[PDB]
Input
Amino acid sequence: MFEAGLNFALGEEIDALRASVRRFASERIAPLADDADRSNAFPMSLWREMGELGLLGITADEAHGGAGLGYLAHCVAMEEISRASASVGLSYGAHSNLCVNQINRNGKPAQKSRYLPKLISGEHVGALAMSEPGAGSDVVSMKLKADKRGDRYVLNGSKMWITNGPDADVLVVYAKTDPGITAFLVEKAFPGFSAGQKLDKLGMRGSNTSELIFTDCEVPEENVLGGVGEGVKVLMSGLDYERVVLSAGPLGIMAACLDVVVPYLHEREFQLMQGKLADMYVTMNAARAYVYAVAAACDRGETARKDAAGCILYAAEKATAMALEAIQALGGNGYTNDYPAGRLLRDAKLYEIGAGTSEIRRMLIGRELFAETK
Amino acid sequence: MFEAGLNFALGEEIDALRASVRRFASERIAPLADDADRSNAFPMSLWREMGELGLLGITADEAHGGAGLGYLAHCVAMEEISRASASVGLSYGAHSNLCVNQINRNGKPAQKSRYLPKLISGEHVGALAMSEPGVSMKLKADKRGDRYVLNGSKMWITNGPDADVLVVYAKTDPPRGITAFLVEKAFPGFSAGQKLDKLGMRGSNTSELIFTDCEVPEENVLGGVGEGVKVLMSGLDYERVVLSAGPLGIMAACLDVVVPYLHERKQFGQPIGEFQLMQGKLADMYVTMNAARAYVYAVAAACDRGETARKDAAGCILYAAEKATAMALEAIQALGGNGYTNDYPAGRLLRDAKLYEIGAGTSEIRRMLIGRELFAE
Amino acid sequence: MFEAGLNFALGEEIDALRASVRRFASERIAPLADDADRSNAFPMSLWREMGELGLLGITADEAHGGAGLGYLAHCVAMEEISRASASVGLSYGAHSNLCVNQINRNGKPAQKSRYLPKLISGEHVGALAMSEPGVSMKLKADKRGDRYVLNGSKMWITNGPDADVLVVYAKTDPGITAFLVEKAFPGFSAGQKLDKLGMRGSNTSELIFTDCEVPEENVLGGVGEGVKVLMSGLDYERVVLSAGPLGIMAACLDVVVPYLHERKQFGQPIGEFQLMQGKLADMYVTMNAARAYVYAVAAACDRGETARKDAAGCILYAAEKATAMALEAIQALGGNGYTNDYPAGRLLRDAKLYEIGAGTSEIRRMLIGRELFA
Amino acid sequence: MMFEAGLNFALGEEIDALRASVRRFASERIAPLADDADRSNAFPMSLWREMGELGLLGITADEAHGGAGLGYLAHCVAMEEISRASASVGLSYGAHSNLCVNQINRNGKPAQKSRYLPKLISGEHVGALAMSEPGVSMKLKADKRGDRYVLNGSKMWITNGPDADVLVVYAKTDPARGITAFLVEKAFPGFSAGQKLDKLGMRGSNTSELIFTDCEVPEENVLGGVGEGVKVLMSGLDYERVVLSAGPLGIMAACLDVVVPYLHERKQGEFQLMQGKLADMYVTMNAARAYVYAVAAACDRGETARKDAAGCILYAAEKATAMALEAIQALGGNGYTNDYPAGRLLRDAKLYEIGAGTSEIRRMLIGRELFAETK
Ligand SMILES: Cc1cc2nc3c(=O)[nH]c(=O)nc-3n(C[C@H](O)[C@H](O)[C@H](O)COP(=O)(O)OP(=O)(O)OC[C@H]3O[C@@H](n4cnc5c(N)ncnc54)[C@H](O)[C@@H]3O)c2cc1C
Ligand SMILES: Cc1cc2nc3c(=O)[nH]c(=O)nc-3n(C[C@H](O)[C@H](O)[C@H](O)COP(=O)(O)OP(=O)(O)OC[C@H]3O[C@@H](n4cnc5c(N)ncnc54)[C@H](O)[C@@H]3O)c2cc1C
Ligand SMILES: Cc1cc2nc3c(=O)[nH]c(=O)nc-3n(C[C@H](O)[C@H](O)[C@H](O)COP(=O)(O)OP(=O)(O)OC[C@H]3O[C@@H](n4cnc5c(N)ncnc54)[C@H](O)[C@@H]3O)c2cc1C
Ligand SMILES: Cc1cc2nc3c(=O)[nH]c(=O)nc-3n(C[C@H](O)[C@H](O)[C@H](O)COP(=O)(O)OP(=O)(O)OC[C@H]3O[C@@H](n4cnc5c(N)ncnc54)[C@H](O)[C@@H]3O)c2cc1C
Output
């Protein structure tokens, strides 16, 4: 509902993609956003609908139903989707980027043919499992065991905070094969695999998050993803691309902030208010510029850990700040659950923690700068 | 649980008061804070308990059964209660300051004797109603014989659906045609709307009030007819001072949750409190806590001296409110994923804190007030 | 020099332009920056030099010696210039954009023929005089025959004492008209240069008009149409000027990064300290976001899109960020950062100008906030 | 004109009297030369005797030696009024009266205090404190030789360095808790000051390195015990921090002094933004005062904590810098000229985020303390 903004000239294809996703999001997602938050449940019908629109495999190969587009495209879809529901945006990102994109980049032809088509149609839901109760920030200290036994790897332990955890049919799981790390393709139907009950979160309540438990979970050796002991490389790259695409989550939240604020103020010319509005608009636009420039850079093949970390750092902090201003501009009404401003705040905060914290991002950028400039 | 902090030397009586309230808040209030947020309702049984401890009439005169203490004392009580549950704190503040203190300051002896005793014991709950959907207020009071008839609505009233006694501002003559009234829940033509569904302060019952030819005896005029603007202004100064201890208690709670976590959470082989960035974050929280406290206590003390503090009262609530919300965001940050779950109270602290940047006058209004007064005198 | 950062892929032409301008800047401007600041005087020889490089007419028509380039190119040139000396950059912006570009856009071909060639060669210096001590301007231009007679004053004029050609706004009826004024016109006089906190190499003065005769063929843009003329290119001015703060930010990293390796405390380069890494990260991210936003606005202008809000936005943003970054630069250097031996203090002093000169942050916020309704 | 509104803190008649006195001296005598001190890059030396005469130089010194015998709150108030007139004079004053005189008053033996305090208190002598070095891992050597310690090395960034007659100097008496503080006289052969530094601000505050080349120090000039220097240094830093925090206080008070009168007589929704900005300056001022005064009063009760001293200077220094930036903003073009003092307030304010230990160091100290306190 607030649609002014700087044109970035992303090209006809991406403009069409934007108009498409925006139409889909306003018609099919936005009406369910509040309900998803209130019921604490992802609206499952969206999986196939997004599959049918080609959003789920947007950066995956056209062999398997994918659209073969790039990270700028993915950012735009993620932004429109998150604009309608940040929760659906987060689940979508975790499926389409965390799971699908890692398989597409590190998977062998046989593996991709086996797992991708259903992930891309939305028949299967995907997840990525890296974090553990005692290994979050310090992720390489993970303790999930994977012991070779015949033509199988037996998995023992747990993962935590997994987006789409209770629903995922296919998961990319990192495990210690030598306490070092290996990535595995895990099916929900593998015996010894279980999901915990969904978490009760401050925000992202439409997004089903759970622990995972592995009790003698047998994984075929042909389901290793990217080679034994080479899980850390796979992980690292996975974090880069995660960072760029997920930074569009905050973008969508910021767009939603203006969506509620501007019409509100037009149904309800004070100067402090106009200044507040200006700061929101300018922030939104700068954040867009930065994220799109980083995404285009990734598409040209200049992926730097620095700038991906930087754009999610920046966008996440700005989205939270702006949600606070959205509530503020609405006043008392903004403090009620009758308006979505509160939910925008609750949702936005996740991005300063998930995908690595602000602290970890700042440190990565600092250490990297210092390392390359010596 | 986190008890580091600057000693402000408030004296033995205030130190003892802090000890009593802290004991009550930790033993009684904290274990039901989550429940209050979840059920979206005030735990009514607390009223009489707070009544018993002498907290509800803390600034009311001893002649009417109050404790006869001042705003510094009241800030301290409000802080310790808010630290345990910010919802309970807001309700308490609205009862004991917005209502009880307005009556203590402005009431004739007979109004005070009629209304104060049950408000002080907690048999009665109290509220204050000023704000409307549209001091250009529209609530109308017309004379009818020896009574006043009230017509209109008030919005966003803390303790609204439960209040037995209300201080209500109304137009008797449409500017300097405002009058304050003591209203009883019992008066016909008075009702409360449904309770609000809020981001935070969910344990604090809030609603609109609807006055439909509501009859108020002329003897219930509070502070003289046409004089409502003076009663309202003064009320606002004291309201801001006492309510600013709400953000203080929330800040204290941020430290309570974060500090034991910094010790107990290990990553990279170390408690995360040993990492430079986290030490910095902690330092900033601590310094902010102490500065906010210093400012608020100084303003309250000035009030107890009977000094002017309009700018300074607006200022200490502006300041505290903004800091508390910022600090709750950092508390969630410091706890990480755990801090993003409802199993931890950090999220609740954030949701509750934001209230004070709107409720009881917004940040914007506080800024404009302060700047205007400066630019004049 | 710190030359790392996001690639924006501006194209071969702009990249070659950046390279040439940077070579010129480090060779000819940078060694004079301190001296310009200490003597409070523009190094005049730079005019002809910049004229020889085609920089003064970068966005002006080729038929008059201009480069015929656009605002993105101009921002890049302005950025590389300001990175070597902010004062030189400010004077350069006033000459090449505020004066030359206004003539190029609103000047009749005869006027451009008369005034542009020397401005472009650098034989003449250009200025813009709009601001007055008090749309409430009081400089009056009275039509007496084939002449307009100018009486009044203008204030804070960049290149004031040196300008040969000035675009000058005046009230012809209280209503506004822009004029081309020559230094040689009798009744025109410049006041002594101001003594400023920063931008000390940039010669600012008041102007005084006492019965100054301007011929009617020197009306710029049409009688009573001065406000359209002004409004136009307040925008382009904002875009191009926002590259001043960009140059300064680049300069901040230019001084901070090397120092973070060389300085050692507690047995380590200070760059290994976590708070330091945090700070450097915030600087880097800010630099990239600001560049992204300014380049996007400039490219929008070059596509001929309207960008009132976004031009005001990008200078608002970039000016505030540059000042904050200069502060951190001083911080990162410690005691040394506090001495005039290092350039950090100068960068802070210079940066503050852009929040307060050529508009103010408050005006920019109100403008954006009003145009966004409200 | 001056801005004199603000929250009353009820500091008592003695302190209110001191405040009126110093504010009179500051606006009458110091303010008119603040720009001169800045432009000439030189402390106005004649101020020393005058501040001695007003009882300001030994404000926390024992009365038996001529001092006022007042405390840290009192000292903060004096520092604040002085700094409000000229931050440079305030920094030189702070270094003399707290960094030097107070260290001697707390750690000196009776004979040491008798010998050195009287001329420092009357302002006949200028005092300094020397601890920092270009490289507590300092390199300044003090080798015991007979009944004298021989000093070799250098100190850097010393306030009042070129002028100091008496300096408290820290050195390593054993490169293995091997630190000792010393009372050093300018008159000692082998001691000299370097050229005065050329600084962004605090330009009226003379700052230099010190150079000790086989500088002979009498062994009776050991301050507070051989090897005990780390203790002396640390406590010195706590009190340094509390009193110097009033430097930023004075700078903030100056910001309002320049802004509020200007905002009246200047006339063009930017003015509402302006009122908001004025509100934030006012509130910030009052908050910082409340905190600094609370920490100082705590010190006067005998409660000194590393945390709170560090905290109040961290807070105040950051606030003063931000407010100076706003003062310039509020005065617009005029604020950007050297004809108004706002530019100077900014340049000066920045110093307090570095000197006395950077904001980074303060944050770490506080965090490490809290962590130790809550394990
Ligand atoms: C909604 C949600 C969805 C998620 N989805 C997924 C998923 O799909 N896949 C997946 O693998 N994981 C997922 N996670 C896990 C997520 O990545 C973790 O929450 C986070 O990365 C790990 O932090 P933690 O929760 O262990 O907190 P901690 O790591 O304990 O952090 C606590 C605090 O300490 C700070 N800190 C830690 N180390 C340092 C240091 N060295 N220096 C300075 N400060 C430090 C942090 O900044 C933080 O403030 C999800 C989490 C959430 C909340
Ligand atoms: C928990 C809670 C308890 C409350 N309890 C009581 C009570 O007991 N008694 C009572 O009388 N009231 C009470 N209120 C009312 C409360 O004070 C109002 O909600 C608050 O003052 C804001 O009113 P509003 O919702 O109409 O905001 P609005 O006034 O609609 O605010 C809209 C936005 O515009 C801004 N704005 C408005 N006017 C201007 C202007 N002139 N210039 C610049 N900006 C402007 C505001 O900052 C705000 O961001 C309570 C509110 C809350 C939230
Ligand atoms: C280095 C430099 C170079 C310059 N070069 C040029 C040039 O080449 N050409 C040219 O025309 N001008 C030039 N200027 C003028 C410049 O645009 C002004 O100095 C400034 O942008 C406008 O503010 P002011 O100086 O008049 O101060 P004021 O506008 O008086 O500022 C006082 C404060 O009040 C606020 N305020 C300002 N106006 C209003 C209003 N109408 N209503 C409410 N509040 C308001 C502002 O936010 C400001 O913070 C230059 C200035 C500088 C410093
Ligand atoms: C005007 C002035 C007057 C002075 N007067 C005196 C005086 O009278 N007596 C005296 O003894 N000294 C004096 N000093 C020196 C002052 O104490 C030092 O400048 C300060 O203690 C340290 O600054 P530095 O130059 O050593 O910076 P550095 O130590 O080189 O610091 C460089 C940067 O690294 C950062 N850093 C360093 N260590 C760490 C860490 N462990 N973690 C994170 N970040 C870190 C710092 O924050 C800083 O940003 C004075 C200085 C000035 C500027």
Q: What stands out?
A: Chain B touches chain D through 52 residues (CB under 8 Å). The domain at 126-235 of chain B is CATH 2.40.110.10 (Butyryl-CoA Dehydrogenase, subunit A; domain 2). The radius of gyration of chain B is 21 Å.
